[PDB]
């Protein structure tokens, strides 16, 4: 959470980065999300939210893999797929 | 022993693949299946089948003559 707060605040530094956030956000969120609001969103998050949210998107989900280069040892898609769940859990 | 990564050298080949949970396990099982086994059978009858019918012919004739050798034996013994 702290990393993300740092990132956010740090990223919004100077005319350009800000201007770009305005214009782009208007496109995407319809409005401009005031720093404070992001800070509130981040604060809400804690371990449980992470586990629940991570599981929702990553747990036992099908990956899209892209490879390039000396990839002979890149694991087979089945194998990568199997790595998206744990037999302990 | 030999591991992936130390097998051999490969140049410029792309390989697209798909998740098993995204495709069918039996695409066109019968539609494309039968035609193909016909095709593979056809492709090989002539080298596999011949020696077997040869055995087949020799097996039926072989037992035949075995019975007709003794049972048929008498036959004639006339005096």
Mutate to test the interface with B, among A69, A73, A79 (most CBs of B within 10 A): A73
3-state secondary structure string across chain A = CHHHHHHHHHHCCCHHHHHHHHHHHHHHCCCCCCHHHHHHHHHHCCHHHHHHHHHHHHCCCCCCCCCCCCCCCCCCHHHHHHCCCCCCC
Closest residue by Cα to residue A70 from B8, B16, B1, B18: B8
Domain count, chain B: 1
SS3 B61: helix
**HSE toward the beta carbon, residue A37, CA cutoff 13 A:** 5
Closest CA to A72 of B1, B18, B17, B3: B3
How many angstroms separate the CA atoms of B79 and A45, rounded?
Answer: 118
Measured between CB atoms, which of B4, B7, B19 is closest to A81? B19
* Cα B9 to Cα A38, A69, B3, distances in angstroms: 50, 12, 13
Polymer length in residues for chain A: 89
**What are the chain B neighbours of A77 within 8 Å (beta carbons)?**
17, 19
Q: Half-sphere exposure of residue A48, counting CA atoms within 13 Å on the CB side?
A: 2
Give the nearest partner residue to A72 out of B5, B17, B20, using CB atoms.
Answer: B5
Tokens 């693949």 found at: B17
Chain A residue numbers touching B22 (CB-CB < 8 A): 62
Q: What is the DSSP letter of B8?
A: -
**Domain of B32: which CATH number?**
1.20.5.210
- How far is the alpha carbon of B12 from chain A, nearest alpha carbon, in Å? 10
Q: Which residues form the domain of B55?
A: 1-79
Q: What is the resolution of this structure in A?
A: 2.6
Query: Which method, experimentally, gave rise to this model?
Result: X-ray
Distance (Å) of CA B59 to CA A77, B47, B48, B66: 53, 20, 18, 11
């Amino acid at each position: 959470k702290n990393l993300l707060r740092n990132a956010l605040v740090s990223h919004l530094d100077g005319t350009t980065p800000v201007c770009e956030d305005i214009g782009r956000s208007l496109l995407t969120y319809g409005r401009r999300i005031p720093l404070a609001e992001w800070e509130s969103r981040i604060a809400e998050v804690d371990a449980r939210v992470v586990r629940e949210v991570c599981s929702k998107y990553f747990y036992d989900q099908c990956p899209a893999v892209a490879g390039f280069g000396p990839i002979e040892q890149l694991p087979d898609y089945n194998r990568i797929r199997s790595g998206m769940f744990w037999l302990r859990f | 022993g030999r591991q992936f990564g130390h097998l051999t050298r490969v140049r410029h080949v792309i390989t697209y693949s798909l998740s098993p949970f995204e495709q069918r396990a039996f695409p066109h099982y019968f539609s494309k299946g039968i035609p193909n086994v016909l095709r593979r059978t056809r492709a090989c009858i002539l080298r596999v089948a011949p020696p077997f019918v040869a055995f087949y012919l020799v097996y039926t004739w072989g037992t035949q003559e075995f019975e007709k050798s003794k049972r048929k034996n008498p036959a004639a013994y006339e005096n």
